[PDB]
Amino acid sequence: KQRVFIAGHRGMVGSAIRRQLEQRGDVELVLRTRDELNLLDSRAVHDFFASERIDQVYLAAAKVGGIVANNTYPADFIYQNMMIESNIIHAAHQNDVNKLLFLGSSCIYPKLAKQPMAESELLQGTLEPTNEPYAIAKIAGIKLCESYNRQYGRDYRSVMPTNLYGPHDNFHPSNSHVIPALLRRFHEATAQNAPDVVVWGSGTPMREFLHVDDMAAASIHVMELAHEVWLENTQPMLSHINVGTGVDCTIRELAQTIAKVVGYKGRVVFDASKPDGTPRKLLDVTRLHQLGWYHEISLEAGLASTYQWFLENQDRF
Amino acid sequence: KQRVFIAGHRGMVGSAIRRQLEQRGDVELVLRTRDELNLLDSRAVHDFFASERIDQVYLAAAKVGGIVANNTYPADFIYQNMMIESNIIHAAHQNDVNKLLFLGSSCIYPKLAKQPMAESELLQGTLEPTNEPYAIAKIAGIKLCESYNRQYGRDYRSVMPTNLYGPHDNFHPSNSHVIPALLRRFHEATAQNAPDVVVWGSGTPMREFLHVDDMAAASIHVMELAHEVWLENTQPMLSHINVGTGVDCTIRELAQTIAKVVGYKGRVVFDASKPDGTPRKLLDVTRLHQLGWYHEISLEAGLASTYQWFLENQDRF
Ligand SMILES: NC(=O)C1=CN([C@@H]2O[C@H](COP(=O)(O)OP(=O)(O)OC[C@H]3O[C@@H](n4cnc5c(N)ncnc54)[C@H](OP(=O)(O)O)[C@@H]3O)[C@@H](O)[C@H]2O)C=CC1
Numbered sequence: 001k002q003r004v005f006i007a008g009h010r011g012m013v014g015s016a017i018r019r020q021l022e023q024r025g026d027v028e029l030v031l032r033t034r035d036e037l038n039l040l041d042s043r044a045v046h047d048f049f050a051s052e053r054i055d056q057v058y059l060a061a062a063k064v065g066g067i068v069a070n071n072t073y074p075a076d077f078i079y080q081n082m083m084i085e086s087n088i089i090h091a092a093h094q095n096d097v098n099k100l101l102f103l104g105s106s107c108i109y110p111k112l113a114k115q116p117m118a119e120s121e122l123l124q125g126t127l128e129p130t131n132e133p134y135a136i137a138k139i140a141g142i143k144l145c146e147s148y149n150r151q152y153g154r155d156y157r158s159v160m161p162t163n164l165y166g167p168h169d170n171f172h173p174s175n176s177h178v179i180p181a182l183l184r185r186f187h188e189a190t191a192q193n194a195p196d197v198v199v200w201g202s203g204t205p206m207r208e209f210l211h212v213d214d215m216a217a218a219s220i221h222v223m224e225l226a227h228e229v230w231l232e233n234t235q236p237m238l239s240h241i242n243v244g245t246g247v248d249c250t251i252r253e254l255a256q257t258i259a260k261v262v263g264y265k266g267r268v269v270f271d272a273s274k275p276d277g278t279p280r281k282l283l284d285v286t287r288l289h290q291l292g293w294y295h296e297i298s299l300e301a302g303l304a305s306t307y308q309w310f311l312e313n314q315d316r317f
Numbered sequence: 318k319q320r321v322f323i324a325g326h327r328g329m330v331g332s333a334i335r336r337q338l339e340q341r342g343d344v345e346l347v348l349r350t351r352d353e354l355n356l357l358d359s360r361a362v363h364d365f366f367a368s369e370r371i372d373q374v375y376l377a378a379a380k381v382g383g384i385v386a387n388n389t390y391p392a393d394f395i396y397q398n399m400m401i402e403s404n405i406i407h408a409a410h411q412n413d414v415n416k417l418l419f420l421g422s423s424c425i426y427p428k429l430a431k432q433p434m435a436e437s438e439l440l441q442g443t444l445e446p447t448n449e450p451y452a453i454a455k456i457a458g459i460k461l462c463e464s465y466n467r468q469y470g471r472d473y474r475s476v477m478p479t480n481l482y483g484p485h486d487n488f489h490p491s492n493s494h495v496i497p498a499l500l501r502r503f504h505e506a507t508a509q510n511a512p513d514v515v516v517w518g519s520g521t522p523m524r525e526f527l528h529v530d531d532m533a534a535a536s537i538h539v540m541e542l543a544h545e546v547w548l549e550n551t552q553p554m555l556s557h558i559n560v561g562t563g564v565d566c567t568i569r570e571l572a573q574t575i576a577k578v579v580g581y582k583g584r585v586v587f588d589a590s591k592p593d594g595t596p597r598k599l600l601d602v603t604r605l606h607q608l609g610w611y612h613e614i615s616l617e618a619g620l621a622s623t624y625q626w627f628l629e630n631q632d633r634f
């Protein structure tokens with residue numbers, strides 16, 4: 001029976017992985033809250049790995065946030081993520097944990113990357129200013145993995161998710177992420193019976209979204225693949241695997257679908273006097289598909305269930 | 318009287334900065350050996366910054382090495398450099414040290430960068446495989462600086478040196494760096510009276526070199542410039558300053574000059590059946606020059622004095 005440590009098990013991604021691993025007895029979960037184990041503390045992390053007998057590690061702990069947070073607390077974002085990654089990865093190795101899965105992000109790719117973005121797009125150009133510090137920390141996390149794999153013969157794998165959504169996401173009004181922000185706005189516009197909801201931009205840009213449960217499934221799939229199969233589909237210095245749907249849709253389609261899911265009867269209006277972001281942004285998931293994994297949750301279905309979750313948990317936001 | 322902490326004061330770059338700051342009483346030096354203070358230990362570093370009253374920090378501590386070391390111990394190179402940087406920069410901030418100078422490297426630029434390499438060449442393309450882990454750690458160091466500057470209003474500056482040479486360099490036979498490797502080989506070829514010295518490649522590629530004392534001078538200059546002057550010549554997210562001569566010379570010219578300096582009478586032979594590296598590699602030092610600093614040590618002069626140092630210290634290698 002495999003003893004698995006899921007760092008940051010309370011977070012959106014961490015909890016989703018936990019929900020799926022709890023549903024099987026061939027695995028025993030070792031979990032620690034931030035109050036029980038501060039991941040920024042090197043000594044505490046080594047002590048923990050030394051006392052417990054960990055077989056696998058899902059590194060889902062991170063200092064995450066929206067556009068405002070990333071530009072407001074850049075030092076906290078680069079520093080904390082760098083320490084958490086370093087502490088866990090090095091402690092794991094020091095205590096003979098050979099298997100580890102690092103969760104990156106798609107913000108890591110160059111701002112002007114070629115679409116769809118293949119894994120080799122990594123470090124091919126300048127990063128988006130807003131995400132720069134966070135992105136550098138994450139890229140460092142991947143390189144730490146590859147370096148321990150190369151030097152010590154470890155099996156530290158990494159997955160790069162596209163935009164995620166689902167339960168436990170940040171539905172607070174401060175969150176800039178489009179899905180939870182729109183679910184909230186349309187929910188309230190529906191409740192207050194507002195004639196219209198104005199969204200900035202033309203609605204023409206295309207984005208990719210993946211439900212968090214699909215994310216967790218792909219993660220566990222990649223974690224559990226045969227080492228030989230993984231080595232065969234990756235390179236020692238280009239080892240990360242993109243995780244997404246490979247399907248993009250316009251913001252207009254997204255807003256319109258959310259309106260329907262929520263039961264909003266007003267008008268969805270796009271104010272084109274405001275600028276759009278990049279025209280298109282999606283991952284090339286060829287590598288993942290060849291590894292035999294395909295997503296199961298469609299946008300409409302995922303938005304419906306997530307809204308359902310938001311309804312039962314709204315007295316938290 | 319300014320209290321200055323020079324991390325890694327025993328190293329090549331660290332010691333050069335120390336030699337120049339020791340030669341002035343308006344500064345008081347706080348130094349700690351690796352045995353006195355382990356920079357990888359977070360608690361020890363915070364304790365030190367808490368006990369001492371540091372005004373400035375020259376971050377010259379690093380896990381450095383040649384081609385063999387970087388490819389043999391990649392994990393040690395990325396991990397140690399990331400921890401040392403993180404620990405010092407965060408501890409400094411936590412204890413109100415507002416001034417800090419971070420020493421990067423030119424290995425940090427993309428493999429296929431445009432020559433000469435301006436500071437904006439950073440993160441514009443893939444890194445040299447050999448230096449990848451080290452390079453990522455260093456880039457992270459720069460971004461840590463910029464992030465603390467942005468968030469907390471700190472004054473953490475950074476300089477990017479070209480290839481360095483001078484006393485305290487690694488003259489061991491294991492060192493791959495061209496200058497100390499050639500000084501050693503020509504020294505021995507001269508002593509054993511070998512008819513020739515064969516060097517791999519055509520000798521046509523061009524490289525830039527800067528004596529370590531010039532390096533230290535430029536560093537101290539950049540550290541002591543007026544904050545307004547520095548802000549005026551840099552950008553918050555493109556703040557590093559290239560440090561070099563801006564002059565390149567062929568490997569052939571380099572080997573021939575070393576032969577002369579050492580008094581070698583044999584033949585210098587280039588074996589063109591072996592591959593060359595990139596054709597040209599040098600820094601654009603426009604930004605540094607506009608800051609009013611210019612190098613003083615020429616190649617012939619620097620090679621002569623360095624050889625002199627090697628002679629008085631050969632019973633160490
Ligand atoms: N969020 C998103 O939109 C998606 C995320 N990703 C990837 O998923 C990763 C996880 O994101 P997500 O689940 O949404 O974020 P969450 O903030 O929900 O998860 C982070 C978790 O880590 C814990 N944590 C942070 N610092 C510490 C610490 N010092 N000690 C102990 N625990 C700590 C947090 O606990 P607490 O809250 O108690 O402090 C939290 O439970 C990201 O880093 C990113 O790489 C990719 C695309 C999108």
Ligand SMILES: NC(=O)C1=CN([C@@H]2O[C@H](COP(=O)(O)OP(=O)(O)OC[C@H]3O[C@@H](n4cnc5c(N)ncnc54)[C@H](OP(=O)(O)O)[C@@H]3O)[C@@H](O)[C@H]2O)C=CC1
Pocket residue numbers: 324325326327328329330331350351352354355356357377378379380381401420421422423455478479480481482485494
């Ligand atoms: N070397 C070169 O060719 C040039 C270097 N640079 C830049 O200069 C920087 C310094 O390089 P250089 O002076 O040549 O290297 P050195 O190895 O001579 O300097 C590193 C110093 O840091 C100390 N150190 C390392 N780890 C620790 C630790 N954990 N605790 C305490 N002290 C520690 C080392 O001490 P000890 O030896 O006692 O362990 C050593 O004295 C580089 O990182 C690079 O960014 C740029 C271009 C070229």
